[PDB]
Give the backbone structure.
Amino acid sequence: QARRALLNGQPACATARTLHRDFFLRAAEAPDADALLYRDQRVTRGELAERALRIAGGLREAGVRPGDAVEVSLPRGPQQVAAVFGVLAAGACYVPLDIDQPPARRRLIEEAAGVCLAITEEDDPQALPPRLDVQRLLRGPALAAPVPLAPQA
Amino acid sequence: AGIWSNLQSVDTVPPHWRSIPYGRPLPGQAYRVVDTHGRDVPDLVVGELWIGGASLARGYRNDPELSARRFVHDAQGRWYRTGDRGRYWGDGTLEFLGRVDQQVKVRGQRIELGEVEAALCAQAGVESACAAVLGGGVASLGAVLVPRLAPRA
Amino acid sequence: QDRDQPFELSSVQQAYWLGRGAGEVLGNVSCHAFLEFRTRDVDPQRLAAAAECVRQRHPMLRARFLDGRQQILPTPPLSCFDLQDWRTLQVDEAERDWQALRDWRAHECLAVERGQVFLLGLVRMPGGEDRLWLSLDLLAADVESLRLLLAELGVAYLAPERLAEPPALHFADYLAHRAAQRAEAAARARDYWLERLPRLPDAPALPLACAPESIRQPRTRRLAFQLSAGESRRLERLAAQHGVTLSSVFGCAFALVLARWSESAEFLLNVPLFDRHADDPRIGEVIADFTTLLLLECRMQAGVSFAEAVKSFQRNLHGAIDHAAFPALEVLREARRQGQPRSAPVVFASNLGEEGFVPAAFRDAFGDLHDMLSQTPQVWLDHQLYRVGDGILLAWDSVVGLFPEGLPETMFEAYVGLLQRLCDSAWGQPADLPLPWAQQARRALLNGQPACATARTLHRDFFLRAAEAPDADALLYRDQRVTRGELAERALRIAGGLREAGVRPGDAVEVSLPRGPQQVAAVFGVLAAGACYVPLDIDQPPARRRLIEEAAGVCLAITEEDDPQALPPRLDVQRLLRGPALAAPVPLAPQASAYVIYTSGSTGVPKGVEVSHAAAINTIDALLDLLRVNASDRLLAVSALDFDLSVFDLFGGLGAGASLVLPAQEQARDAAAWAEAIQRHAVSLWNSAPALLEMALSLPASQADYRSLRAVLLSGDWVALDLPGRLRPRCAEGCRLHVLGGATEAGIWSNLQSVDTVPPHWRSIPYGRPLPGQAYRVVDTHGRDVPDLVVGELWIGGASLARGYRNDPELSARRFVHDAQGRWYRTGDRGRYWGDGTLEFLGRVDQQVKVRGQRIELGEVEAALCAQAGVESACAAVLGGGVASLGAVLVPRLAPRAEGSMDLPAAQPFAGLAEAEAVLTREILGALLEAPLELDDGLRRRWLDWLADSAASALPSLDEALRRLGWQAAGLTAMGNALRGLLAGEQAPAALLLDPWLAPQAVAARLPDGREALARLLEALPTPAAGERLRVAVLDTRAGLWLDQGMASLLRPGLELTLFERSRVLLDAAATRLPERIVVQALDDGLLPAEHLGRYDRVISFAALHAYEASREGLALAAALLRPQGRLLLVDLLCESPLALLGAALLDDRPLRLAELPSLLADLAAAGLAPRCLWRSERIALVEALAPGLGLDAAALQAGLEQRLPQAMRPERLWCLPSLPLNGNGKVDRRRLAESMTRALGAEEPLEAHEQALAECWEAVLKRPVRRREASFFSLGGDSLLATRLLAGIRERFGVRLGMADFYRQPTLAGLARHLQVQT
Ligand SMILES: *P(=O)(O)OCC(C)(C)[C@@H](O)C(=O)NCCC(=O)NCCSC(=O)[C@H]1CSC(c2ccccc2O)=N1
Ligand SMILES: [N][C]([C][S])C(=O)O=P([O])([O])O[C][C]1O[C](N2[C]=NC3=C2N=[C]N=C3[N])[C]([O])[C]1[O]
Ligand SMILES: [Mg+2]
């Protein structure tokens, strides 16, 4: 029990904060740095933070709000990463699914998650959750900052 | 438990490892290993890995009853009750020993065989199903069906 | 009710109003809500018009608060709208100005005395942001009424034409209705609450960094957490499933946090509920204060499901709404009127109105609530809730600096953690919170510390150290030293002697030997026999010894005597040393019992703590490996053998081959003997209770040089904060003090706070980290761990626990307990972790008592007495008697000052006097020997020898003896007759000490020119020359007959006299015979009442300073009793009266107590008294000596205790001592102090003009007749409401500006007169 209380007792080694906080800091600190590299093109932290904050503004415009949840269902690539940061920066909890996740199973998850919205390249405001094009959320106005989430959201 | 809960560094494998163990718990989070009655098992004894401390998920998104079955509370705080089996070796390392239950790994991903079986019972015409990950180098997921017969006199 | 005339405050408005009081407990603040809101732009003139429009709509926004009543203005004098247009400024200067404006108007006491209960305002930031904000004093309004003010502002900003109707129901008509309408319900609930006041729980016993009385400027710090839509939905649907109002969910979860953070899970929390019930539906639009305050006595159960806990909280909450018909404030008043300081300074304001807190008409006009602040007075933790968005803003308006830093943060993080644990998981789960993981993670490291020990039999290493180096020093004694080989072969001789006597592995053996090498050889011999040693003091009384022999089930006793026929077979250690040697120690597996150490058998059946070798050697290694103990070290065994510290001295010290300097049994508490032992044998290690090292350090650095002392261990009792500071220059360079924690039930110790010096945040030296291999918990009464900073019971765990109480398994299951965390000794120490993982110990659990209306922190009373000028040390206890009084005790430090230079007037005595007393000694020896059977045979033979030895064979004289003595042959006859009659009654000591012819100091007050000694002692009492009042006292009064013999020299005009003795029956005679101008008071059970400190300009001692257990004892008693510049007047026996020596032989008390003139004057100058010797040569030597500024006086103590303690822990009686008495096991004897005070315990009109003119003020305000001064205002019938009318009454009656906090510390009539006496 002594050994195990040491190994369990290992101190927090963390600063409790909103999960996105640090990326938006790394972006504000070096907007030009390569955040993403993808299919032989690249995205800066500034570009990604803006793309995310535009998605966030599009999500607050689409009725998403702090600790409410948002499905993200995008092919693997920068728009996916921008969307999860944009969900988190809208204050929301992202509910990732593969775009390959099949429709009846996706409906079990969309039903069980109580999900406010889904981000999917498809626009369909009449889906089980309202379903949204990330490319349209990328036309959204940028939020000037991520929404202040307390660390436990 | 959050993205991980242990770290075995591996500069080399000492030959007595039957598997690469779960190492020390990651900082700020913890492991118990318990008897089926919730008390800690002694070192080298196999029991159920309870992950604990600050890294844990808050629960399942809209399943409070399964949350209470997993995210349990004890005189030692809050614990995820994983259903992984394992043992603390005498040096306080945590050998993970696979799972006792219907949950298995396919091409790295987590699958509940109860999910595969239920997705087969969701077939009109299946009375019940079994699923298992199989032997051979393919490591394939297999399943087995009982059809429902639509009786008459 | 006339709509602009003064009308009564609602009860809960009085709670805010009286909380504005600069002298009220955590008062001086508004009870305002500050709200803050954001938008890019708003028209400031629309706002200015809107704010003034809502004032002229609602009476209560324009209500003035004065004289504890409210009165409504047609419009207020002071500005409605604090516009601050900064659209031009630099952004960050505007932000700093906003933060100043924010901190100001969010902490602001609004001018409610000028009707400014409502104030709107607006910074216009140059960043393009109009931050509308709103300071509403809740004297106007409920929070549920504040959202209606927002509704009115939202409309009045956007479309003021739609403000269709100003709500016609005036708040005075609502009160004039409500206060009459409630009447039966209020009485019905008053009867409920009155009968519950003794049974009400406390405020939540949370960790406070500051006393609430010790801050005048309570800034609220808000903590907040927005539960989302989804978390709100999950709580709302789960609240529905479990059948509870959503306020009950949040209130239950809050009360579970406060329970987990309280010392006890039962407390009051003030629930402001929303009594917006009225006949007019427009009450739903009136802005006045519809708060009603519910004193929810929550009692939160542990380990139940949250589903049970929340239904319980709801049932309590709902049922208590009916009892809130008599308002919580009047319950808190009636508690004060019943002598209980109860409060609900923690608050649960569930403003959960389903629309969103900020109403939609306002959410259109400005963004939903950005931030907010309370300033609720007299409330530590104002928890509120708001629907925000469609989510729920949790808010905790904690107070800045009141809680520890990071505590409202962590406690609130646990509350949010709980509420998400309620969202995402079913309420069938335990209502017990987790410890917030960071706290538990640290404590898992502290408890996780590896064994750092090898499991082995406790004696093992000593027998190795002997086989390695047999000629090395093991023990150093009175003169001689025993080597390891000698000690090992002596131990193994005793071991074989014990095997032969039938003792065998783990069977228990008493070791009652005087401290010395044979005692050590006996414990190592018992342990080498494989047996378990049961050490006892040889001076322990026989009845207690039989209980311990019985209770240990003791196989055998080693006792320096053979009696194989006793309760156990009892053996002489010298015969056991004549026994055969064992070849080797009998093999024990380490888990076997090593010793059983016994507490005092005054506790009923003696608790004997059986410790295994594994446990003992674990603690020992865990300390040897920290002390780096080595073969050159030399410990001092000041620890008695029945005090478990000796186990480290023995099996630790000699396990490392470090030799023991042993005090002998006559040196068992002697600091001078220890000091020489350190200075002589170059002692490198020390180990004791702090009261022993305090006693060692009480000797000067020149008299007692400890600079050999490489490291110091202190244990078992509170270590004073100055003590490391006193110790650093005394011990070796690199002082290495360690203070060590925990009871014998955890082996010798369980903690180590290393001390270089005290960091200034300590209030006692804490328990440190647990020692290696063992562990601590602090637990709630339910056995769950309490959080950091939270006081609970200390539990000790792991590889050092005692096996149990030796033959009480039933108590062992109560005091040792078992969890998923392993096995724990449940100590009954209070204490708390700190954030850094240090473990503050806070006294035994009985060192708190729920005395008659409050929990007393007796450790805090001791800490506050130690802060007095000139105090060495203090104790506090709670007593017997019909009051069950608080009691406390002091000691002065005496300012040692080397004034002792002298000459002795030797010219008056001659040898024919000592011959006269030798003759009279022979005659009265011979006179008792006319009936020689009144003695025992030992005294008979002594007396028959002294009939020649104390007589003409040494100091012969003729009948001239009689004329030297002053008593003639009539007196010789009267002595012989009295002595035979008294001893045919056998009435020594008691009647011998009552007798004029025979009492030892009284015969010394005649025979040795004793009346002439007494005369020249009493002479120069200056009052019949000076014509001025003089206070005299006597230390050694006994029967008063020796004083009566001097009394013609004592009855001086202006002389006041007080008479003292450490005995009751003798003072009854003194009090019988001496006139009513002379006072008599016992030092009952050794204890001086504090009313006498610093009071006496003169103090008398007669032929009895040796009758104290030190010179330093009776001297320190004298010095404390003396007024500064006052004179001790002493005759000391540099030789006894030969008849007082018969007297002492009939007490059978040793003549070795007596001391020389330099020996007296050295200790007396160390007691600070500056001396002259004066008289009677080498016999009955007169000394007088002058007192320094010791500062102790009951007046000065009252002023210091008024400066440092609340009225609920006044030292209800107060006493003093020359030093605190000591346990056999080293501690300050808090039981003897408690019993002694319990023995020493044993209305009238106003008579000052200020008391009488105050009685007129109390009688005017309270109506009831103020005939008695001794009453306290609240106990008589006062309230904080009535304290305003009393202050204003004093401001009419006398004109003085009353400090209301000082009046709350001074609630009795003369205590109130204090501020009038000083014309404040
Ligand atoms: P006195 O006549 O009061 O008699 C003596 C006693 C001992 C009773 C006196 O010293 C005392 O304790 N007075 C009562 C103090 C008290 O109870 N204070 C708290 C009243 S509570 C209240 O309803 C607050 C808390 S929640 C709410 C609020 C919400 C939003 C924004 C601000 C505030 O304050 N109001
Ligand atoms: N010696 C001892 C043990 S160490 C004994 O014996 O006694 P007791 O009672 O049991 O114990 C003591 C008491 O107190 C406490 N402590 C310890 N340590 C200390 C203390 N206090 C204070 N400080 C310190 N350090 C214990 O636990 C008990 O209660
Ligand atoms: Mg004890």
User: Anything to note?
Assistant: Helices of chain B lie at 64-70, 113-121. The two ends of chain B are 54 Å apart (CA to CA). The first helix of chain B runs from residue 64 to 70.
